[PDB]
Design an enzyme around this catalytic site. Structure first.
Site, PDB file in Angstrom:
ATOM      1  NE  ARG B  60      -3.628  -0.134   0.132  1.00 18.36           N
ATOM      2  CZ  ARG B  60      -4.292   0.142  -0.981  1.00 18.36           C
ATOM      3  NH1 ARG B  60      -4.407  -0.750  -1.956  1.00 18.36           N
ATOM      4  NH2 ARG B  60      -4.848   1.346  -1.120  1.00 18.36           N
ATOM      5  CG  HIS B  97      -3.555  -2.832  -9.992  1.00 15.82           C
ATOM      6  ND1 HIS B  97      -3.771  -2.349  -8.720  1.00 15.82           N
ATOM      7  CD2 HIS B  97      -2.435  -2.222 -10.446  1.00 15.82           C
ATOM      8  CE1 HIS B  97      -2.811  -1.495  -8.412  1.00 15.82           C
ATOM      9  NE2 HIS B  97      -1.987  -1.404  -9.441  1.00 15.82           N
ATOM     10  CB  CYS B 104       1.434  -1.805 -12.111  1.00 10.24           C
ATOM     11  SG  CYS B 104       1.215  -0.898 -13.623  1.00 10.24           S
ATOM     12  CG  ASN B 118     -10.638  -4.137  -7.456  1.00 16.03           C
ATOM     13  OD1 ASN B 118      -9.905  -5.097  -7.685  1.00 16.03           O
ATOM     14  ND2 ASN B 118     -10.185  -2.991  -6.915  1.00 16.03           N
TER      15      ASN B 118
END
Ligand SMILES: [Mg+2]
Ligand SMILES: [Mg+2]
Ligand SMILES: [Zn+2]
Ligand SMILES: [Zn+2]
Ligand SMILES: [Zn+2]
Ligand SMILES: [Zn+2]
Lengths: 162, 162
Positions: B60, B97, B104, B118
DNA sequence: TTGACTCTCTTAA
DNA sequence: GAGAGTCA
DNA sequence: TTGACTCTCTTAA
DNA sequence: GAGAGTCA
């Protein structure tokens, strides 16, 4: 408890009790525009739930038996699998609802798999829509579909490539 | 409160900094037995990470800018979406993501959607394998496949029907 | 104003 | 998706 | 012995 | 997948 005989007896008494839960017919998407019917054996909404059963959370229950004068207790959906390995590839095995109905305790609607495999069934297209689960889904997952994405990938400048 | 111009300036400084992260070429499954390539802009493993960036957990990070003496801080992947609605259908929007690579920060690899949407991308068959996401996946999800189910639905007696 | 750490929290299986 | 403790 | 409650924990996004 | 505090 410890012995195989004692474990089989636990499973048998659990099945007899769950077998007396109300049977609720649910019509479900199968994928591919087809519909099927599942018969869920649903634990009651409030006490009493059945011999050996008690609610430990809004949609969590436990099964309890007294063996060798001691109390043995399990998560209420784990009892069918007491003779199975409790891990796979180093991941904990979990009871997984193929009917996506937490109150249901029908062992024909349960499997025993990693939490990742368990979760992933929520998005499966279903047994008539392309399910590739080796232990096949009973229905299309409730979250299958296009989603409701608010914003897609984007950049303001020219720094990035896909 | 920050003006639209101030927010755009934040997004622009974020893009400028992320654009200097190491760009790593990854070969990925697209579904349907096809292979493709994604170019991820990966935050470093240890400090320093880049101007404005700091690690608040194992995977994080946060982005911080001080504007007119006030410290503003955002989750490091949320910055591309600061001009978007922050909820939809009563659910909080999350950075998601499409490349399934936490480090990334390529905004062309991110979308903005509910946590359920998600998560579900982890099991998607991919853009060449049957993806139905309206904002299309960039690759097959890492957890797609037959799974590793340890035990399937079963009963010892005859108390149940599916 | 900035970096590099610290802590706890959300969700739904 | 779990385990365990407090009472009656 | 059995029932009906209470509490916190795990995982990986 | 998130928010926020401390210190120099
Ligand atoms: Mg499940
Ligand atoms: Mg994700
Ligand atoms: Zn069921
Ligand atoms: Zn399936
Ligand atoms: Zn990426
Ligand atoms: Zn997809």
């Amino acid at each position: 408890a410890l012995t195989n005989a004692q474990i089989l007896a636990v499973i048998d008494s659990w099945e007899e009790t769950v077998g007396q839960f109300p049977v609720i017919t649910h019509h479900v998407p199968l994928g591919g525009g087809l519909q099927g019917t599942l018969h869920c054996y649903e634990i009651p909404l409030a006490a009493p739930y059945g011999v050996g059963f008690a609610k430990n959370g809004p949609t969590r229950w436990q099964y309890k038996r007294t063996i060798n004068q001691v109390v043995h207790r399990w998560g209420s959906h784990t009892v069918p699998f007491l003779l199975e390995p409790d891990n796979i590839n180093g991941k904990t095995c979990t009871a997984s609802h193929l009917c996506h109905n937490t109150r249901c305790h029908n062992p024909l609607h349960l499997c025993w798999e990693s939490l990742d495999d368990n979760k992933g069934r929520n998005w499966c297209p279903g047994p008539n829509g392309g399910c590739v689960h080796a232990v096949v889904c009973l229905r299309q997952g409730p979250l299958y579909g296009p989603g409701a994405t608010v914003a897609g990938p984007q950049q303001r400048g020219s720094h990035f490539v896909v």
